[PDB]
Write a protein that binds this ligand. Structure first.
Ligand SMILES: [K+]
Ligand SMILES: [K+]
Ligand SMILES: [K+]
Ligand SMILES: [K+]
Ligand SMILES: [K+]
Ligand SMILES: [K+]
Ligand SMILES: [K+]
Ligand SMILES: [K+]
Ligand SMILES: [K+]
Ligand SMILES: [K+]
Ligand SMILES: [Mg+2]
Ligand SMILES: [Mg+2]
Ligand SMILES: [Mg+2]
Ligand SMILES: [Mg+2]
Ligand SMILES: [Mg+2]
Ligand SMILES: [Mg+2]
Ligand SMILES: [Mg+2]
Ligand SMILES: [Mg+2]
Ligand SMILES: [Mg+2]
Ligand SMILES: [Mg+2]
Ligand SMILES: [Mg+2]
Ligand SMILES: [Mg+2]
Ligand SMILES: [Mg+2]
Ligand SMILES: [Mg+2]
Ligand SMILES: [Mg+2]
Ligand SMILES: [Mg+2]
Ligand SMILES: [Mg+2]
Ligand SMILES: [Mg+2]
Ligand SMILES: [Mg+2]
Ligand SMILES: [Mg+2]
Ligand SMILES: [Mg+2]
Ligand SMILES: [Mg+2]
Ligand SMILES: [Mg+2]
Ligand SMILES: [Mg+2]
Ligand SMILES: [Mg+2]
Ligand SMILES: [Mg+2]
Ligand SMILES: [Mg+2]
Ligand SMILES: [Mg+2]
Ligand SMILES: [Mg+2]
Ligand SMILES: [Mg+2]
Ligand SMILES: [Mg+2]
Ligand SMILES: [Mg+2]
Ligand SMILES: [Mg+2]
Ligand SMILES: [Mg+2]
Ligand SMILES: [Mg+2]
Ligand SMILES: [Mg+2]
Ligand SMILES: [Mg+2]
Ligand SMILES: [Mg+2]
Ligand SMILES: [Mg+2]
Ligand SMILES: [Mg+2]
Ligand SMILES: [Mg+2]
Ligand SMILES: [Mg+2]
Ligand SMILES: [Mg+2]
Ligand SMILES: [Mg+2]
Ligand SMILES: [Mg+2]
Ligand SMILES: [Mg+2]
Ligand SMILES: [Mg+2]
Ligand SMILES: [Mg+2]
Ligand SMILES: [Mg+2]
Ligand SMILES: [Mg+2]
Ligand SMILES: [Mg+2]
Ligand SMILES: [Mg+2]
Ligand SMILES: [Mg+2]
Lengths: 50, 118, 31, 94, 49
RNA sequence: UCGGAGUACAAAAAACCCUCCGAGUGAUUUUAAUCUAGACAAACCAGUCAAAAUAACCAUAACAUCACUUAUUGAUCCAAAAUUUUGAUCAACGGAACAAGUUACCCUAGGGAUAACAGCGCAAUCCUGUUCUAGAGUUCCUAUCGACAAUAGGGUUUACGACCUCGAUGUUGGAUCAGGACACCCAAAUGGUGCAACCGCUAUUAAAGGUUCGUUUGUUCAACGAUUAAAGUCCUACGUGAUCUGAG
RNA sequence: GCCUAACGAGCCUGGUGAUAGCUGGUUGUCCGAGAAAGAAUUUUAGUUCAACCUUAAAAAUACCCCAAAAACCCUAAAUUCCAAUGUAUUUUUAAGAGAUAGUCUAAAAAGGUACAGCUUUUUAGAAACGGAUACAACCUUGACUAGAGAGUAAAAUCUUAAUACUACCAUAGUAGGCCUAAAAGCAGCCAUCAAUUGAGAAAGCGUUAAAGCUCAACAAAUUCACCAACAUAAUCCCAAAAACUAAU
RNA sequence: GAUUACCCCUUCUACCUUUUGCAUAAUGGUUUAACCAGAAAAAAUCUAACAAAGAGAACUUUAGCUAGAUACCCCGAAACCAG
C-alpha cells in the first residue's frame, strides 16, 4: 500500500486536491476527508484507492 | 459546518522543475500580475464574491493588472480557483507618455508599446 | 488558547495527586 | 418497467448517472490551470516588510476625493430663464 | 473554432480581438479622404490607454 | 417559570414531547449607607457590575458569608399601613379583577397548513433466494431440515411520514366482466432421493387454457358435508356503485 | 314533533353598510432599488418590537485584515480581534411599510429503523430561456435592445460481466502401550521409536471390531494453475444503431 | 421562426388566485356589451410668503410660524335585540 502509493503515475491524487482546496472542492468534501485521504467513505474502507 | 479553507504554506513551495515547465525565472520573480476571471461567483460562498468584487474582476474574460506584493497575493490565494494568472512581459519596456495611446496587450501576456505603426 | 504556543502553561492537576476526598458513604481505609 | 423511487436526483435512492470521459478531461484542464495559478503566487516581488505603507498617499487621496464628491450633494441652481421660458408656450405669428 | 491554435501563434482566441480585421477602417470615401472613425474603435483605444 | 453540564469540541448566540441534575429557600452575624465617572447585557419591560466623592466605624474603615452559589422569583392598576412600607401555586409563572361540562339535533367561515379511505416515500414488521456449518437425520453436514450469524432483492400486511386532493379522490363484502405477474394448484418435459413398483418428499424449465357446488356468519377469513386433473399466491384506486346490490 | 314547502326554535321590517385574525376580488404604460422569520403574546391562520430593506439627508471610515492576544484533564474543521493592501463602502439623523406558515443539496450533530421526498438547530449554496432525454433545490452562467457575425463554459451511451487439474505406487517389527464387550494407523489416554533406496504407531473414507479403498514417501516425470460464480412483479420491451481514415 | 407555398418542418407544460413547490387531475371563468373596489393631513419631506417673529383675534415660538401639495378598499356569514 506504500509501493502502490510511491509509484503512482497519476499527477493528481486525493491528498493533493483536498488539502490545497483546488477547484473549490472543499464545498463538497467533509472536514474529515482531509485526514481520510479519500480512502474512507462512511464506514466503508476501500483499500485500492490511492 | 462549511467554513473557509486554510491553504498550507507547503503548497506554494515551487519545485526546481516548476520554473522550467512554466517559463518562470529562478532568481528574479516577475513584477506584475495579469488576472482574468474564468468561472462564476454564483454557487460560491459570499466571502469569495467580495474578494472578486474588490479585485476589479466583476466582468469575466477581461484582463486586470495587479501588483505582486503579498497583500494582493493573500486575496488571490482565496479565489485562485476562479481566475487565471499570467505574468506581464514587457518586450519594449514601460510605455512613455508619448506612446500611451498605442499600447496593446496580446493574448500571450506581453504588452506591445507600438501597435500598428503608420 | 489551543492554537497559541503558550497552551497548557497553567497545567497543575498533574503535579499534585488526585487526593480523593473522604466521602461520607465511601469513607473506608482501602489499603 | 423500472422506475426510480421518488424524485430521481434527491433522497436515499438516486439515478445511477455515471461520470463520462468528457467530464474527466474537463476536470484535468481546470486542474492544470490551477496548478499554474499557485506557482505564480509562490514568489512575491516584495516581502511583507518592504510593502509597509508603500502606497498610502494615493489611498488617502482616493478617500478624500470620495468625501469631497459626496459632500457636494446639494440642490441645483434655479434661474430666471426656466421660469420665463414657460411663457413661450403661447408664442404666435401675430 | 480552433482558439487553442490561435493562442499558440500569438493571435487572439476570438478573431475579433485586436486583429487587423477589426482595427482597420472598414469603409472610406471614393475620392480618398479618410472616413470618420468608428464609435467602437475610439472606445477600444480609450480602455487600452 | 428560573439555574448548572452535554447536544453547542476553540469569542458570543443557537432548537426539539432531546439526554441528565436541581430551584419556588434555610443557617449565621460581618445588619451590609448616601451620591456619581464609565461599561457589560438587551426588541421592549426588565437585569447586572462600578472608580472618584461624602458619612459610618481601625479615626485618611463598603464585596454580609456558607450550602455545585449559579436559580431561590411576579408588571401595572388596585388595596391596606405611618407619610418611609407591605400584598398573589396571578405556577396558563410579560400575569383578563371575578366564568365548567356536552352536542350523533347541530350551524357558519376556512384548511389537504391537519386526520380517516386511496396513491406516493421508506422497509421496522412482512415476503423470497443465496453464503456459512455446529447439529437433527442409527453411521453420514446439505435425500428432507438446519440454531448463533452473513448478504441481496420483492413492495401483499400492520405501522411510520403528512407530499397531491376537505368550492368532495363515495367507503366492506358479494353479482356481472375480467386485464396482468410467476414466487405454479392441475395439465407437459426433467435432475436428486434414506427413489424396487405404487404412493411420496425436493429442485430446475414452462403462464396458451383451467382452477366446483353447498350448511352457519354482512362477512373477506375460518370450520364442516360432497366432489374434482386442481379447487394456486398476489397486483390491478386491497380492479369494477355515471353497471347493480346496502346485509355490515 | 308541529306552528304556511329549511323550526335545537317562525316569518317580515327596523337596529344594519351588524362583525369577521377566515375565503374570493382589486381596473393604464415604462423605469430604479428590493426582504424567508431573533423576542413576547388564550400566541404560533394574527399582531407589536429588533434585524434586514426602501426614500431623503449628514458625516467619516467600512470590508479584506499580518505579527501579538483569548482556561483550567484530552480534543478536528476553524471563529473572535487587528496594521498594511485591494477596493468604495459604512455609520448617524428624519420618514416608513412588507415579512415573521420554507424547500432541497453539501457539511457538523440530535430523535428514528446508523428508515423516509421524515423531524429539530448551526455554517454555506441555489431557485436558466443552456446542460443532467423529461426535471423548483445538482452543474455551467454580471439576465439591456437590434444583426441572416464570432470565441468559449457545463455537458451526450458506465465498467467488468473470470475458476479443467489427469501419472505411478504401496511392503517390517506391530493387535505399540493403555483402554474397552471388542479399540488391529483410524472413541479416548499415552508415546510417536523403528526394517527397507523408499513409506506418517497416521491425512481421509470405511468396519461392531477386522478386512478394504485413498492421500503423504519410492521411482517415473516436469506448459500453467493464490483467488475472483448470487432469483423474481404485475397495461406493452423501449431512441434507432455502431468494436478504428488520424481528436487537448 | 418562417417560406415561392394555408398545412407539412423546427421551437414552446393555458391564464389568474393560493403555495416551500401547481400544465397539474388545486380554485374561478361559455362568450359579448354596460356597471363594480384606496377615503382622512398629528409628526414629517417638497415649494413659497414673512421672518425673532408668524397668522384677517382666541394660538404656536431658543429659526421659527402661516398657506399649498403628498394618506390609509369592495363582496360574504351562522347569529343578537326590539316592534
Ligand atoms: K429518490
Ligand atoms: K398566558
Ligand atoms: K417506514
Ligand atoms: K377530500
Ligand atoms: K391464469
Ligand atoms: K389567528
Ligand atoms: K483406537
Ligand atoms: K378540489
Ligand atoms: K383554496
Ligand atoms: K380566482
Ligand atoms: Mg417520481
Ligand atoms: Mg446521482
Ligand atoms: Mg452591547
Ligand atoms: Mg471608593
Ligand atoms: Mg390594567
Ligand atoms: Mg407565557
Ligand atoms: Mg422571559
Ligand atoms: Mg385588559
Ligand atoms: Mg341517538
Ligand atoms: Mg360547512
Ligand atoms: Mg406548513
Ligand atoms: Mg377511493
Ligand atoms: Mg394513508
Ligand atoms: Mg390520488
Ligand atoms: Mg428494498
Ligand atoms: Mg450427527
Ligand atoms: Mg435487508
Ligand atoms: Mg399535506
Ligand atoms: Mg413538514
Ligand atoms: Mg372541482
Ligand atoms: Mg369479484
Ligand atoms: Mg384472467
Ligand atoms: Mg419458474
Ligand atoms: Mg404437473
Ligand atoms: Mg374497490
Ligand atoms: Mg363495491
Ligand atoms: Mg346508480
Ligand atoms: Mg365508477
Ligand atoms: Mg342497514
Ligand atoms: Mg317555514
Ligand atoms: Mg365586512
Ligand atoms: Mg415561523
Ligand atoms: Mg421594523
Ligand atoms: Mg492573526
Ligand atoms: Mg481595521
Ligand atoms: Mg405566521
Ligand atoms: Mg425546512
Ligand atoms: Mg424535509
Ligand atoms: Mg440558510
Ligand atoms: Mg433543458
Ligand atoms: Mg451581458
Ligand atoms: Mg503417493
Ligand atoms: Mg426460483
Ligand atoms: Mg422503441
Ligand atoms: Mg412545471
Ligand atoms: Mg400544500
Ligand atoms: Mg408567501
Ligand atoms: Mg384546473
Ligand atoms: Mg381550495
Ligand atoms: Mg368551473
Ligand atoms: Mg402636518
Ligand atoms: Mg350580547
Ligand atoms: Mg326577538
Amino acid at each position: 500500500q506504500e509501493e502502490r502509493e510511491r509509484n503512482n503515475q497519476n499527477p493528481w491524487t486525493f491528498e493533493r486536491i483536498a488539502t490545497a482546496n483546488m477547484l473549490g472542492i472543499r464545498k463538497v468534501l467533509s472536514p474529515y476527508d482531509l485526514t481520510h485521504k479519500g480512502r474512507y467513505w462512511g464506514k466503508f474502507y476501500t483499500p485500492e484507492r490511492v | 459546518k462549511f467554513t473557509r479553507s486554510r491553504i498550507p504554506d507547503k503548497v506554494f513551495q515551487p519545485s526546481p522543475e516548476d520554473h522550467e515547465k512554466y517559463g518562470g525565472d529562478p532568481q528574479y520573480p516577475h513584477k506584475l500580475h495579469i488576472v482574468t476571471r474564468i468561472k462564476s461567483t454564483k454557487r460560491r460562498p459570499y466571502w469569495e464574491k467580495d474578494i472578486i468584487k474588490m479585485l476589479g474582476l466583476e466582468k469575466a474574460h477581461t484582463p486586470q493588472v495587479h501588483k505582486n506584493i503579498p497583500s494582493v497575493n493573500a486575496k488571490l490565494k482565496v479565489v485562485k480557483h476562479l481566475i487565471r494568472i499570467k505574468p506581464l512581459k514587457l518586450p519594449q519596456g514601460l510605455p512613455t507618455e508619448e506612446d500611451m495611446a498605442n499600447t496593446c496587450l496580446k493574448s500571450n501576456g506581453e504588452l506591445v508599446v507600438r501597435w500598428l505603426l503608420n | 488558547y489551543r492554537s497559541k504556543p503558550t497552551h497548557g502553561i497553567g497545567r497543575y492537576k498533574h503535579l499534585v495527586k488526585a487526593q480523593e476526598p473522604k466521602k461520607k458513604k465511601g469513607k473506608v481505609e482501602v489499603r | 418497467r423500472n422506475r426510480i423511487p421518488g424524485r430521481q436526483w434527491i433522497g436515499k435512492h438516486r439515478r445511477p448517472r455515471p461520470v463520462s470521459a468528457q467530464a474527466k478531461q474537463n476536470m484535468i484542464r481546470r486542474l492544470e490551470t490551477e496548478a499554474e495559478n499557485q506557482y505564480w503566487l509562490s514568489r512575491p516581488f516584495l516581502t511583507a516588510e518592504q510593502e509597509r505603507g508603500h502606497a498610502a498617499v494615493r489611498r488617502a487621496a482616493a478617500f478624500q476625493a470620495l468625501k469631497a464628491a459626496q459632500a457636494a450633494r446639494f440642490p441645483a441652481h434655479r434661474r430666471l430663464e426656466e421660469q420665463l421660458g414657460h411663457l413661450l408656450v403661447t408664442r404666435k405669428w401675430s | 473554432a480552433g482558439s487553442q491554435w490561435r493562442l499558440q501563434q500569438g493571435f487572439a482566441a476570438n478573431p475579433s480581438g485586436y486583429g487587423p480585421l477589426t482595427e482597420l477602417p472598414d469603409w472610406s470615401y471614393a475620392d480618398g479622404r479618410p472616413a470618420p472613425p468608428m464609435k467602437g474603435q475610439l472606445r477600444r483605444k480609450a480602455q487600452r490607454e
